[PDB]
Each structure stands twice: as C-alpha cells, then as structure tokens.
C-alpha cells in the first residue's frame, strides 16, 4: 500500500512558516527500561496541506502518504482536530473555552 511508516498520527503544529506545509510536533510515549515510567519522546513530522487551514498552535490529525512527496514532506493534514481557541466540544458540538461553555447548551 503505502511507503512511509507511521500511517495515522495526531499531532500539534509548531510552525507554518513555509508555504502549503506545516511543522507538526508529535509525542509518543516510550518506556524507560530501568525507570519504568512513560515519557513523551517527541518527533517532528511535516504535514502537507492545501488550504493553509492550520495556524501556529492547533492540534492536527495527519494521514500518511503512499509516497513521500519531498525529501521531508511525509503526511497530509487529513483533518484539523482542535482549532486554536475555537474548539468545538466534540460531544455536545458547540463552541467553548477551557472548561467553560461560551455557547452553552440547553440552547
């Protein structure tokens, strides 16, 4: 099927400071073999988009490509999960701040 490895990834955009691509910082959880606690080891993946939809700070999904389309461009931003600020609260789908409902339900 595809050639690049990590098929399906959610991440966070750092910098959109090029054209039609975004820099996405993703975190796995890896185990210390000795200390035996999980720690966020990051890695930086690029993400190609079309509409320049993302701005610096959002949480983005990104889907892997069947072929890398540059030397470092690897995935396309298949959906943008959490917008900066304008987070649609995914169950009860309505705009909200941190922990407080801007558009309250019982609408």
């Amino acid at each position: 099927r595809s050639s690049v490895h990590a098929r399906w990834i959610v991440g966070k955009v750092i910098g959109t400071k090029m054209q039609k691509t975004a820099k996405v910082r993703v975190t796995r959880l890896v185990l210390d073999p000795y200390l035996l606690k999980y720690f966020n080891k990051r890695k930086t993946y690029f993400a190609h988009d079309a509409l320049q939809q993302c701005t610096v700070g959002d949480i983005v999904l990104l889907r892997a490509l069947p072929v890398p389309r540059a030397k470092h461009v690897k995935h396309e931003l298949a959906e943008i999960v959490f917008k900066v600020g304008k987070v649609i609260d995914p169950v009860t789908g309505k705009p909200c701040a941190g922990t407080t409902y801007l558009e309250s339900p019982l609408s």
Binding site: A6, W8, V10, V26, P90, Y101
Partner: protein, 162 residues
C-alpha cells in the same frame, strides 16, 4: 523505597496486569480529561493509573493527552479505516472504562487464545537449539544414544587408533 506516590505503577508486573489490547486497525488513542472536575475523576484516575498499562500491551499506538481543552472528559480513537470512535467517560470510574474499551476495541479472548499457539509452534520442541532457542544441542543429551566423547571415553570402533 521506590520514588513515586503510588509506586506499584512501575513494576513490570503491573504493566502486564492491564488487559486492554487493541486491534490492528486502531492506530491512535487520544485522551482528553479535566484537571479539577468533581464529576470527572474516572478520567483523571484513568490517565493516572491505567494508560501506562495500555501502552505496554499495544506499544505502537500513539497515545496523547490534553488537559483543559474542553469541559467534559472524553476519549477519541483513530481507526485505520478512518472513522473516529468517541468514547465518553464523564461520571464513570477508572474501572468501567477499563471494561468499556475491552468490550469495544479490546481484542476478543478467542482472538488472543488463537494468537497463543502460533507463538509456540516456531519454538518447536524437537529442534536442536543452542540451549537458548531450544534444548538438546546433541542427541547425546537425550538418553540411550552413545554420549558425546567428552562425557564418556568412546569404544574402539572409532578411527585414529582403530
């Protein structure tokens, strides 16, 4: 002693006590949980204890945690086909959601029991492995055969002084 608060979480027997192992088609589980909600304490004690147990058993799924991005706790999964499961967790305990994923996206025990014989057949008993992959490097190391001429002096039917 050990340096944590609940320090049983770092013992390698605990991380195996989790049982929620994901199917091949789940590729990201993303959790989002409130930090001071009186009503969401299950999704706080979920990520406190349980998701280290999940990561030891499906160790390639990306797990990611967010803190105050939403008023209600939820889980959201990212299947390989492309749909997004939306598990909710609010006003549950940390126990029910260790039961609410193993009945949805946890593997069936029939599909893990049939996954346990095939891990055995490649470690097949009658191979002659170098005491690390299998037993009996010689047929001298089973009884009845003529035993490995370091162990015995062998009869005069050998060459060299025949």
């Amino acid at each position: 002693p050990m340096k944590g608060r609940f320090p049983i979480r770092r013992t390698l027997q605990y991380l195996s006590q989790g049982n929620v192992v994901f199917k091949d088609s789940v590729k990201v589980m993303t959790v989002n949980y409130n930090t001071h909600g009186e009503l969401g304490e299950g999704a706080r004690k979920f990520v406190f204890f349980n998701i280290p147990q999940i990561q030891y058993k499906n160790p390639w799924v990306q797990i990611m945690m967010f803190k105050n991005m939403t008023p209600s706790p939820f889980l959201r999964f990212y299947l390989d086909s492309g749909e997004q499961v939306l598990v909710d967790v609010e006003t549950k305990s940390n126990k029910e959601i260790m039961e609410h994923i193993r009945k949805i996206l946890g593997k069936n025990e029939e599909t893990l029991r049939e996954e346990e014989e095939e891990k055995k057949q490649l470690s097949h008993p009658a191979n002659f492995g170098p005491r690390k992959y299998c037993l009996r490097e010689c047929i001298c190391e089973v009884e009845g055969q003529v035993p490995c001429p370091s162990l015995v002096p062998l009869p005069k039917e050998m060459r060299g002084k025949y």
